A paper describes a structure:
IFM also produces sustained isometric contractions at pCa <4.5, which we refer to as isometric high static tension or iso-HST, that correspond to an isometric tetanus in vertebrate muscle. Here we report a more detailed view of the rich variety of myosin head forms in the iso-HST state resulting from improvements in both data collection and analysis that have increased the resolution by 2.5× over the earlier work.
Advancements in data collection and analysis for ET since the iso-HST state was first reported suggested that now is an opportune moment to reexamine this state as a reference for HST specimens subjected to a quick stretch or quick release that are currently under study. Adaptation to stretch would therefore require a different mechanism for rapidly placing more myosin heads on target-zone actins. It has been suggested that when a muscle is stretched, two-headed attachments increase by recruitment of second heads to single-headed bridges. Our results show that two-headed cross-bridges exist in isometrically contracting muscle even without stretch which shows directly that this mechanism for adapting to stretch is mechanically feasible in active IFM.
Numbering used by the authors:
A (entry chain B): 14 to 163
B (entry chain M): 4 to 204, 218 to 571, 575 to 626, 647 to 843
C (entry chain C): 5 to 149
The structure:
Amino acid sequence: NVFSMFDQTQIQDFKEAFTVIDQNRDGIIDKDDLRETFAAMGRLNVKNEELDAMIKEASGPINFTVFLTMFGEKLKGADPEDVIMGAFKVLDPDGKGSIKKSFLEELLTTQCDRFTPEEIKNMWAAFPPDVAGNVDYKNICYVITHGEDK
Amino acid sequence: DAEMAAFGEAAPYLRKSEKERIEAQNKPFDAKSSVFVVHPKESFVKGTIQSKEGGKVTVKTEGGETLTVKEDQVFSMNPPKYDKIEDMAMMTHLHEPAVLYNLKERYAAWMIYTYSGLFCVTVNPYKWLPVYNPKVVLAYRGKKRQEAPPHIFSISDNAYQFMLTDRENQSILITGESGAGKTVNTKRVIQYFATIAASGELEDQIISANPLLEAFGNAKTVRNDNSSRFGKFIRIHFGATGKLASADIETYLLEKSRVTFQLPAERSYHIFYQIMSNKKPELIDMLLITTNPYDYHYVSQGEITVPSIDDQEELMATDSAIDILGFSADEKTAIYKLTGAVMHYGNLKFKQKQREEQAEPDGTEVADKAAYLMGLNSAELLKALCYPRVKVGNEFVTKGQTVSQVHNSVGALAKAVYEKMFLWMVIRINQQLDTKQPRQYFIGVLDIAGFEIFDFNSFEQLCINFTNEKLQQFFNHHMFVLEQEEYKKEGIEWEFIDFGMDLAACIELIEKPMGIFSILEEECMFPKATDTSFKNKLYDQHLGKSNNFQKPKPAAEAHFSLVHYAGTVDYNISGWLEKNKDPLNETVIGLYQKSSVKTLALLFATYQTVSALFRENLNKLMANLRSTHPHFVRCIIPNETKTPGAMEHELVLHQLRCNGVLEGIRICRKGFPSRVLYADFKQRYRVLNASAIPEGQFMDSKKASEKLLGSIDVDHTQYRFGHTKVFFKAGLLGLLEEMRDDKLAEIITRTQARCRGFLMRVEYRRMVERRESIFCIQYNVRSFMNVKHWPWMKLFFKIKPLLK
Amino acid sequence: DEINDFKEAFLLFDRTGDAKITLSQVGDIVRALGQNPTNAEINKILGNPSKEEMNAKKITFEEFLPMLQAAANNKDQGTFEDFVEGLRVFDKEGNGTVMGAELRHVLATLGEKMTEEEVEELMKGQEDSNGCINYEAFVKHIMSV
């Protein structure tokens, strides 16, 4: 599933990300490579159990492919931002100003079995303010592709 | 309401308040049950259908009565939308009852003017109304009859309009029974003309006219005390500009027979009694008569005096009128002198020459007077009379007459002379009513009686009926012509034969050569003919061979019935020969022709029977009527008892048949009566299937109505479209409305549905589209919720930026 | 009963995930599955009995499909003939002329009603600034689904 969405651009973003964590340039990221990438980003308080927890997710040396497979496997239902924006633009169909909370509450719960009312309240809390104001779909897309603080 | 102001005060009698209307048209109605029905005592009363005997019907009444009457003793009832319809011919229910009923309702509401096609029905108020109101006159000025409520000035103005618009002459035909009140209208129409188009930078002459004609063409009938024996035709000659220029009167039937005869309770023309009244004694000596009418057989066969009439007063009225009328004293002298000769004639006596069957004068006492009074020679006169010198072959053969033949010929002249004179007077009147100014068109106003049926129909009846049966055909045609234009304008495909044609049968039988009149006027030439003689000739020639010709069905007496449009008239032939003689002895006429009394001389220059003219005059008339744009007015008489706001049924019903009203409805109901204008069609009925919508709304005022009729469980036959409107049969539009109110529930409810349907049909197209975009959204979020807590993903996150 | 697609369409309007749609949604699902039904007709049979229609269409496909077929029988009334004509009866003044106000109130206040919202939605840019609407085109755009 993890090689089927997954475009060349996404994969290059990942390749560059790997080479930035890959301190030694060897081709395999290890505990040492993780330690000074954390240090270069300002994080000095790193304990071995956290570094080890990271590495334990893979069965072998963390090599480009083992990385790409492990990160794909967690994003099995995740698109690139423009594609996600298209789904909202279809729900927008009139254009420019994004949708209201009620209109999508109902459409996530209704056709099919469930986007559960536990999942949806977590959505209004983790998607915001945004979801209250303009149900800011533009913002929603940028936070899922680019991190939570941004 | 807003509109009405002009009338204001009259309004209530012209139109009803905009809610009175509304409260009437918008009310509960049950078509399938509500109906009109036959009724033994009252003509047609209304009721509700109770049951159904398979071809019998039981109905409740409005008064409370239950009757089981045939299937066709039952007639539908118009939806309330047609309450007090200005034009009954717009009704979707062209019945006999519905017409009676419409008139009646708008009368009980004091509306006397209701239209029935082209007609302008008018009902006798029997009381006073602000209608002839000097405000109204203006109001109706410059208005098509669709811009204003039913009224006579409508007709009268439109005529005028039309007159100048089309550059054609016009006519107005007023007609009704004795008590219908036509003179009143006629007069009223006339004022109208005079007012709205005056160039006196008449009004009396105009008036004074009557009282002359009345002395000569009026008499005490057993019904009226001043019955019209008269009819009339005025030609108002309008100028080029459009301003008044001339007038023209003509008188008809003041009934030649009165001059020589009279029923027992009746009397002859007034004049006679006027003159012998003695208010102007010279006259008596001048004419050489007495003051006792029993000296003049011709004029005292019936009655001599009438309490309600003051012969003395009238004599002057008459007298004075003559003058105003501009007659020369001489003429005014001829008139008198001539009117006395006639009395004298009836005194002319004869006797059988010995051993001969010839007539020889029984004295030269009276002849002398008659002779002098007419500017004749006693002898020459008595000869011509006795030894009529005829011209059989290529010469002039002197013929001898019998006593019976003379008495009858005399009578024929008496009548002949009187008539002619009367005609002349009219002309002379018309002449004054003679200017030099140019004339481009005229508007003829015809006032005459309508077909009246009596248990007793004599000669006079035939003459009148005949007049009317002609007038009728005159209409039926105009309508045929008229109708056919619409179907031509619209583009409908309707073929039909002239509606007049139906009557030609009856007319030919009367006016054609071997027809009644002829047989009548020939026999008048036979010195020894009898009413009985005449009769047989009538039969031998028409009986069995002619359909409209029939022998009376005993039920007074009758000699022959005719089948006129209005019905069967039983005619009694007794006196006819005489009455008709007043065939004319041409020798005598000769003498007249060379009288010392110019006027007398004049009257007979166009040269004889009585019916001989009547016809000539009636032809000259019906010809004048043709070069005219006919405008019709039918006057009605509510109740014999003289009561405002009331109506006997069968009495009004009668009139309607003999009027032409019921025949106009017939002819209407054969084609496509009701015709809806397209927008007028949209608005009112859109609601029926309002959805026959995207293509019915981006739309055309015409193509729409087309498209609309797409729906409904309606006969797609019954209608027909054309360039400006749809054509529809009866009770259809009635059907429409119902749906609308009932008929629209149909129309709407159905148009709603599709919409509803369709509405959701678009929802599915959206739901479906959406199908995946959701999923995308669905799954996509879930990821994040899982990921955002993953080391590796946070890492990528802080790191994702340093990249390029 | 029979055909396949309609069963696929039922799940699209489940809105719970149970494959058991409600007796009220009954009247609406019937409207997009090919052909029109009126509200009064749906309300008449099986609709008028609450417990029976709840146990005869507030249900699985088993009673959906027979109710829908029952409606399928009366649908000959889809005939357009009467339904451009009925409209011309409201505003007839030349072409298929209408006025916005007359169709808007007549199709909200009369017979079966319609919400103002739904009527405004039928008037989706087919009645521009002119006030007058063109009948013949609406029946085509209405019947065009």
